[PDB]
Every structure is written in C-alpha cells, then in structure tokens.
Design an enzyme around this catalytic site. Structure first.
Site, PDB file in Angstrom:
ATOM      1  N   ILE A 178     -27.907 -22.063 103.883  1.00  0.00           N
ATOM      2  CA  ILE A 178     -28.930 -22.738 103.651  1.00  0.00           C
ATOM      3  C   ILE A 178     -28.433 -24.204 102.679  1.00  0.00           C
ATOM      4  O   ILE A 178     -28.128 -25.111 102.713  1.00  0.00           O
ATOM      5  CB  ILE A 178     -30.423 -22.558 103.758  1.00  0.00           C
ATOM      6  N   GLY A 179     -28.288 -23.109 101.425  1.00  0.00           N
ATOM      7  CA  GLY A 179     -27.824 -24.339 100.306  1.00  0.00           C
ATOM      8  C   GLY A 179     -27.040 -22.576  99.529  1.00  0.00           C
ATOM      9  O   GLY A 179     -27.071 -21.745  99.740  1.00  0.00           O
ATOM     10  N   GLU A 180     -26.894 -23.474  98.021  1.00  0.00           N
ATOM     11  CA  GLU A 180     -26.206 -22.381  97.432  1.00  0.00           C
ATOM     12  C   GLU A 180     -26.561 -23.338  95.874  1.00  0.00           C
ATOM     13  O   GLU A 180     -27.630 -23.620  95.464  1.00  0.00           O
ATOM     14  CB  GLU A 180     -24.678 -22.929  97.082  1.00  0.00           C
ATOM     15  N   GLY A 181     -27.155 -21.867  95.072  1.00  0.00           N
ATOM     16  CA  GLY A 181     -26.944 -21.959  93.461  1.00  0.00           C
ATOM     17  C   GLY A 181     -25.684 -21.634  92.844  1.00  0.00           C
ATOM     18  O   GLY A 181     -24.296 -21.785  92.904  1.00  0.00           O
TER      19      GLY A 181
ATOM     20  N   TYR B 166     -24.258 -19.125  90.924  1.00  0.00           N
ATOM     21  CA  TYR B 166     -24.207 -17.990  91.107  1.00  0.00           C
ATOM     22  C   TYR B 166     -24.542 -17.225  92.291  1.00  0.00           C
ATOM     23  O   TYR B 166     -24.623 -15.722  92.289  1.00  0.00           O
ATOM     24  CB  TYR B 166     -24.163 -17.154  89.997  1.00  0.00           C
ATOM     25  N   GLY B 167     -25.382 -17.851  93.789  1.00  0.00           N
ATOM     26  CA  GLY B 167     -25.522 -17.243  94.947  1.00  0.00           C
ATOM     27  C   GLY B 167     -25.666 -18.624  96.202  1.00  0.00           C
ATOM     28  O   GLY B 167     -25.154 -19.473  95.934  1.00  0.00           O
ATOM     29  N   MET B 168     -26.319 -17.313  96.990  1.00  0.00           N
ATOM     30  CA  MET B 168     -26.326 -18.733  98.229  1.00  0.00           C
ATOM     31  C   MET B 168     -27.626 -18.347  98.320  1.00  0.00           C
ATOM     32  O   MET B 168     -28.466 -17.093  99.259  1.00  0.00           O
ATOM     33  CB  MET B 168     -25.026 -18.120  99.386  1.00  0.00           C
TER      34      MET B 168
ATOM     35  N   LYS C  71     -32.035 -14.993  99.810  1.00  0.00           N
ATOM     36  CA  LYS C  71     -31.342 -15.760  98.481  1.00  0.00           C
ATOM     37  C   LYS C  71     -30.284 -14.917  97.420  1.00  0.00           C
ATOM     38  O   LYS C  71     -30.715 -13.843  96.873  1.00  0.00           O
ATOM     39  CB  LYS C  71     -32.327 -16.169  97.183  1.00  0.00           C
TER      40      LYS C  71
ATOM     41  N   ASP D 213     -37.784 -26.642  85.902  1.00  0.00           N
ATOM     42  CA  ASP D 213     -37.244 -26.929  87.072  1.00  0.00           C
ATOM     43  C   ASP D 213     -37.316 -27.582  87.643  1.00  0.00           C
ATOM     44  O   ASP D 213     -36.786 -27.043  89.048  1.00  0.00           O
ATOM     45  CB  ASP D 213     -35.303 -25.610  86.899  1.00  0.00           C
TER      46      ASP D 213
HETATM   47  O1  LIG Z   1     -34.099 -20.547  94.464  1.00  0.00           O
HETATM   48  C1  LIG Z   1     -33.159 -21.493  95.077  1.00  0.00           C
HETATM   49  C2  LIG Z   1     -33.681 -21.964  96.468  1.00  0.00           C
HETATM   50  C3  LIG Z   1     -34.943 -20.305  97.835  1.00  0.00           C
HETATM   51  C4  LIG Z   1     -34.839 -21.968  98.738  1.00  0.00           C
HETATM   52  C5  LIG Z   1     -35.921 -21.568  99.884  1.00  0.00           C
HETATM   53  C6  LIG Z   1     -36.225 -20.434  99.795  1.00  0.00           C
HETATM   54  C7  LIG Z   1     -37.572 -20.416 101.399  1.00  0.00           C
HETATM   55  N1  LIG Z   1     -37.085 -20.887 102.125  1.00  0.00           N
HETATM   56  C8  LIG Z   1     -36.371 -22.683 102.061  1.00  0.00           C
HETATM   57  N2  LIG Z   1     -36.287 -22.941 103.186  1.00  0.00           N
HETATM   58  C9  LIG Z   1     -34.937 -24.068 102.679  1.00  0.00           C
HETATM   59  C10 LIG Z   1     -34.489 -24.237 104.847  1.00  0.00           C
HETATM   60  C11 LIG Z   1     -33.558 -25.756 104.286  1.00  0.00           C
HETATM   61  C12 LIG Z   1     -34.242 -26.200 102.876  1.00  0.00           C
HETATM   62  O2  LIG Z   1     -34.427 -27.873 103.025  1.00  0.00           O
HETATM   63  C13 LIG Z   1     -35.710 -25.015 102.781  1.00  0.00           C
HETATM   64  N3  LIG Z   1     -35.511 -22.458 101.180  1.00  0.00           N
HETATM   65  C14 LIG Z   1     -34.575 -23.015  98.117  1.00  0.00           C
HETATM   66  N4  LIG Z   1     -34.389 -22.810  97.122  1.00  0.00           N
HETATM   67  C15 LIG Z   1     -33.999 -23.993  96.744  1.00  0.00           C
HETATM   68  C16 LIG Z   1     -32.559 -24.681  96.031  1.00  0.00           C
HETATM   69  C17 LIG Z   1     -31.875 -22.394  96.081  1.00  0.00           C
HETATM   70  N5  LIG Z   1     -32.271 -22.092  95.319  1.00  0.00           N
HETATM   71  C18 LIG Z   1     -31.260 -21.459  94.038  1.00  0.00           C
HETATM   72  C19 LIG Z   1     -31.013 -22.747  92.948  1.00  0.00           C
HETATM   73  O3  LIG Z   1     -31.720 -24.400  92.886  1.00  0.00           O
HETATM   74  C20 LIG Z   1     -30.897 -20.405  93.438  1.00  0.00           C
HETATM   75  C21 LIG Z   1     -30.032 -19.947  95.310  1.00  0.00           C
HETATM   76  C22 LIG Z   1     -29.475 -19.037  95.033  1.00  0.00           C
HETATM   77  C23 LIG Z   1     -28.630 -18.639  93.920  1.00  0.00           C
HETATM   78  C24 LIG Z   1     -28.825 -19.272  93.082  1.00  0.00           C
HETATM   79 CL1  LIG Z   1     -29.090 -18.245  91.049  1.00  0.00          CL
HETATM   80  C25 LIG Z   1     -29.672 -20.143  92.475  1.00  0.00           C
END
Ligand SMILES: O=C1c2cc(-c3ccnc(N[C@H]4CC[C@@H](O)C4)n3)cn2CCCN1[C@H](CO)c1cccc(Cl)c1
Length: 327
Positions: free
Chosen positions: A23-26, A28-30, A46, A141
């Site tokens: 999905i995405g990253e942070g 210090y993670g993914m 996460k 944030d």
């Molecule tokens: O905590 C989150 C986080 C958890 C999700 C999430 C949860 C449930 N469901 C979906 N659904 C997604 C599907 C597609 C999309 O549009 C929505 N996302 C989105 N985020 C926002 C960005 C990522 N982070 C933070 C940073 O900001 C993070 C992640 C990993 C490591 C670290 Cl240090 C920090």
C-alpha cells in the site's frame, strides 16, 4: 512456505496473513494489505522498524498504547500485533488494522466533493478529534492521507505515530489547537481540491499563511516566541488579508465562517473542537448524544523521553505480549 516478502523487504506475517499487496510506507516501515484466513477478510498491516532509534521506539510505544486504549468509530484501532518470540529476535513490529478502501488525499486528487460530503467528512474528523482531545491526547499529524475512507463514506483517523498526551502545520509550531489548525487546512483542501498553504519550507510556509490571513496583529505577534521567526516576520512588508469568499467563491458561507475560525493565527482565539461541532455548518450532523468521549484522560506512568532505547524495546516487547499465542 517461507517467510513472506514485499518489494524485497521481509514481511513475516504468515501463516495467518497472506496474499500481500503493497500500500504505502512510512519513515521506518511499510503498510500492506493482507488476507486474514481466520476472519476471512483483508486487513491492513503496518510494519514498523523502530529499534535503531530511541525517538522511533518512543513513538511506537506511544502509538500502540494510545490505540489500544482508544475505542471510537472514527479512529483506526489495532486488531493484532505480530513480533518475534524473543526480544533478541524482535527487529520489527507488525500492527494489524481494519483495511480501509481509500483516503482523503487520494479522493481529493480525483474527485470533486459535494458540499454535503465535505460537511459529512468534516463532521467525522471533528467527532473523532473530540474523542482524542477528550483523552488529553494530541494527534499532531492530521492531513488528508491520514484520513481513511471506506466505500460507504465512513471516515477514520489513522497514524498516531506522532500522538502525544509542513502544509498542515500550525503557525505556533514554527496544545490541542494545533490539531484544529490542521483540520482547517483539510477543510480548505476539501473546498478547492488543493492545499491552501503549500510552502516549500519553513519560511515559505509562513509567507503563504500571511499571504491569506494578512500581517499578524501585535497581540498575534507575541504568539511567535521564537526570536529568529519574530524578527523575520517583522522584516516583511505589510500583507492584506484575503477574504475567504474571494479564495473560495463557490463555497458555502457557513463553511467559510467555520474555516475562518479554525484558521485563526492566534491559537488562543482558534475555535475548539466542541464549538466547531456545534457550528451551524455541521448542524445537519451534530448529535451531542452520539459523540462519545474517553472515559478518562490518558497518562503516561513513565516519561518515555528519558528512557534508553533498549529499555523502550523491552517495554514494546512487554506491551505486545498480550497478542502472543498462549499469553
Ligand atoms: O500508519 C500509516 C497508515 C496506515 C494506513 C492504512 C490503514 C488501514 N487501511 C489503509 N488503507 C489504505 C489502502 C489505500 C490507501 O489510500 C488507504 N491504510 C494508512 N496509513 C497512512 C500512511 C502510512 N502510515 C504511517 C505514516 O503515515 C506509517 C506506516 C508505516 C510505518 C511508519 Cl513509521 C509510519
């Protein structure tokens, strides 16, 4: 079947969680989505790798403690936590959360929001925020990508990594009022589909804010205690306030009245979350009977700031023990 992997990174959450998708990253993670073969639904997971840095360890412990305490429809929860069986092997922590379909960042890149949907989203943000602040917690944030949406317009606040007891950053920073500033920025972005104060850096952030609000009043001015910042603002020429209805010509006037009160330069004169919920703009959704608060304020029994990261690692190990088999 070996340990799972996503984009060359270990993502060791099987056998319960499979069929991973990035999905995405942070920092210090993914985050990945995954199939949960127990609940037979897809979930978000996460991955966090904090242990090289005391600050990251601090944030990880706070995030877990806070979300495990919180229970609220507009706030992402924690369903499960995976980590290694021993502290020596623990190099990551996997936090399992409800999977949401999209977020407000993605939504605003592709869709025009009707005034009713803006209203309903704003209401949900503030309803969630009322619960958070009532627990004596700051999110710190709030931004569109941390506001998650499912298919039926339900909104949830996520990413409590910076929670404590640039574009979205309040002028003070450069208190609960900083979250309200963020929400104002998000409302403005819902109105126009673009960030209201898109600065490239610190100084440039201020210039954009001043470009809309006008030059700070003198009572305003000594909200800015930083002496470099204060002289810088004194160094600037006069700036006229731009009326909100000129910036957002087609916006609901009630929405702009609320926006005005959220994007107030002086934090002490900024609207508070309960007042905002009670604003006429949100009248159609306001339901003080159905806006729960936290039963009691949150409090850290240890200050985390002073602890060595090894001790924080031990606390993180203990905190996550409850999700281990046979605990
Ligand atoms: O905590 C989150 C986080 C958890 C999700 C999430 C949860 C449930 N469901 C979906 N659904 C997604 C599907 C597609 C999309 O549009 C929505 N996302 C989105 N985020 C926002 C960005 C990522 N982070 C933070 C940073 O900001 C993070 C992640 C990993 C490591 C670290 Cl240090 C920090």
């Amino acid at each position: 079947a070996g340990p799972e992997m996503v984009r060359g990174q270990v993502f060791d959450v099987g056998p319960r969680y499979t069929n991973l998708s990035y999905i995405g990253e942070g920092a210090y993670g993914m985050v990945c989505s995954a199939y949960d073969n127990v609940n037979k639904v897809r979930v978000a997971i996460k991955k966090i790798s904090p242990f090289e840095h005391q600050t990251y360890c601090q944030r990880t412990l706070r995030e877990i403690k806070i979300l495990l305490r919180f229970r609220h429809e507009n706030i992402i929860g924690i369903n499960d936590i995976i980590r290694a069986p021993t502290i020596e092997q623990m190099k990551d922590v996997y936090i399992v959360q409800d999977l949401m379909e999209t977020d407000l960042y993605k939504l605003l890149k592709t869709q025009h929001l009707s005034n009713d949907h803006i209203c309903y989203f704003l209401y949900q943000i503030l309803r969630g925020l009322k619960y958070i602040h009532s627990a004596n917690v700051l999110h710190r944030d709030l931004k569109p990508s941390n506001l998650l949406l499912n298919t039926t317009c339900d909104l949830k606040i996520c990413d409590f990594g910076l929670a404590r007891v640039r574009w979205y950053r309040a002028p003070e920073i450069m208190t609960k009022s900083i979250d309200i500033w963020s929400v104002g920025c998000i409302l403005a972005e819902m109105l126009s589909n673009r960030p209201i104060f898109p600065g490239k850096h610190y100084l440039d952030q201020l210039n954009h804010i001043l470009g809309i609000l006008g030059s700070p009043s003198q009572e305003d001015l000594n909200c800015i205690i930083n002496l470099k910042a204060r002289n810088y603002l004194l160094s600037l020429p006069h700036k006229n306030k731009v009326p909100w209805n000129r910036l957002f010509p087609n916006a609901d006037s009630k929405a702009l009245d609320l926006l005005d009160k959220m994007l107030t330069f002086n934090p002490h004169k900024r609207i508070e979350v309960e007042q905002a919920l009670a604003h006429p703009y949100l009248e159609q959704y306001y339901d003080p009977s159905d806006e729960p608060i936290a039963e009691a304020p949150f409090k850290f029994d240890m200050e985390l700031d002073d602890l060595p990261k090894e001790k924080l690692k031990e606390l993180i190990f203990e905190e996550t023990a409850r999700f281990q088999p046979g605990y």
